[PDB]
């Protein structure tokens, strides 16, 4: 057999400990590039002029950060949306100053994670599975695209992309609230329902199946040993679990069909996170949360504050302080 | 950086003691 066909058989082999696949041919180099750059930058990169105002922010461990404060810092506002590969810099020193590692990491990462998604489709096809696990992953993937790609596009700069760090994430969230009132946006409210409900239903499902495990073990051993990998029979009594849960609420508020139950578990968090990803992606174009500032006024016209006005006071404190040296003109229009 | 010097021993013991506990239990599980 010819070299090409032997290579193709290897790439798509279902016997590799980790599936490679055609999506993997791009995923592996791009994830490695991003991972290696991220680790080296997080430990040792010098300070980055994120906002383009010649005020470098130190993100790396060797330059005085810990795990919580460290970040790979977004590229300079002076760059905006321009592509800044290493070979566009006069020197590595310039590239580090202006935040080049951030572009390299996020682009290779977004490319690699998109192929991760395709790879999930691909293996499911080689194994004879149904194909939609990749659709579930599209919810986190879209979320990553929103904060690393779409939001920078709409706002005109990767300097307003999410930083690759723990405290940098918090910075991104606070500024976002000030400029968009995301808490008052229903797509973020839907995201919270998605993740609170996902955790609720996660604990519900685990607790109801755990509650109705069939006695297969003694009190000495782990009950986990009553299930054998590959066993044909179910290890719990779903009728019993339905019997418990139907009475806890009422009979029809409880699932009797395992397939319907598990589709619900998939659908609820995925849809919710689709909406919150769409929230970031549309506030990227400045269609912001509801504005009820001074919405209630009395018979004379005095403003009667509501809780929305109190949120607005906090928002204003965030607004006037963020990037304290970066604005010269009174409106922060991006 | 002016960190707490006891931070090093706290972290080292935080890792070592629990980890050693698990390793002891695992190894003697394997040898029976």
């Amino acid at each position: 057999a010819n070299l090409w066909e032997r290579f193709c058989n290897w790439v798509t082999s279902t016997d590799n400990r980790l599936y490679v696949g055609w999506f993997g041919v791009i995923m592996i180099p791009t994830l490695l590039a991003a991972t290696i750059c991220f680790v080296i930058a997080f430990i040792a990169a010098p300070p980055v002029d994120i906002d383009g105002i010649r005020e470098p922010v130190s993100g790396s461990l060797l330059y005085g950060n810990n795990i919580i404060t460290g970040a790979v810092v977004p590229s300079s506002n002076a760059i905006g949306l321009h592509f800044y590969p290493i070979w566009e810099a006069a020197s590595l020193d310039e590239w580090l100053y202006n935040g080049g590692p951030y572009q390299l990491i996020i682009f290779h990462f977004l490319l690699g994670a998109s192929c991760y998604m395709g790879r999930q489709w691909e293996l499911s096809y080689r194994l004879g599975m149904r194909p939609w696990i990749c659709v579930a992953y599209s919810a986190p993937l879209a979320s990553a695209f929103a904060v690393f790609l779409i939001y920078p596009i709409g706002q005109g700069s990767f300097s307003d992309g999410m930083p690759l760090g723990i405290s940098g994430t918090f910075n991104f969230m606070i500024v976002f609230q000030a400029e968009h009132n995301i808490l008052m946006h229903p797509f973020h409210q839907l995201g919270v329902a998605g993740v609170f409900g996902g955790a609720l239903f996660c604990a519900m499902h685990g607790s109801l199946v755990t509650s109705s495990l069939i006695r297969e073990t003694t009190e000495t051993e782990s009950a986990n040993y009553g299930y054998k990998f590959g066993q044909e029979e179910e290890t719990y009594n779903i009728v019993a679990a339905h019997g418990y849960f139907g009475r806890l609420i009422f009979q029809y508020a409880s699932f009797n069909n395992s397939r319907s139950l598990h589709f619900f578990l998939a659908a609820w968090p995925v849809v919710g996170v689709w909406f919150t990803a769409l929230g970031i992606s549309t506030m990227a174009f400045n269609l912001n949360g509801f504005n009820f500032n001074h919405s209630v006024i009395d018979a004379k016209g005095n403003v009667i504050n509501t809780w929305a006005d109190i949120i607005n006071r906090a928002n204003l404190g965030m607004e006037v302080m963020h990037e304290r040296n970066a604005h010269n003109f009174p409106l922060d229009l991006a | 950086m002016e960190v707490n010097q006891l931070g090093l021993i706290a972290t080292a013991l935080f890792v070592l003691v629990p980890s050693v506990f698990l390793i002891i239990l695992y190894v003697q599980t394997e040898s029976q």
Binding site: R17, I67 | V3
Partner: peptide, 30 residues
């Protein structure tokens, strides 16, 4: 010392990944 400590812990985790994947207890059908 604190940089060394953070990198050390992170390096142990990467090592753990290696063993967890390639020296897992193999799942057996039975």
């Amino acid at each position: 010392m604190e940089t060394i400590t953070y990198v050390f812990i992170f390096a142990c985790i990467i090592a753990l990944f290696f063993f967890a994947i390639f020296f897992r207890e193999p799942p057996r059908i039975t």
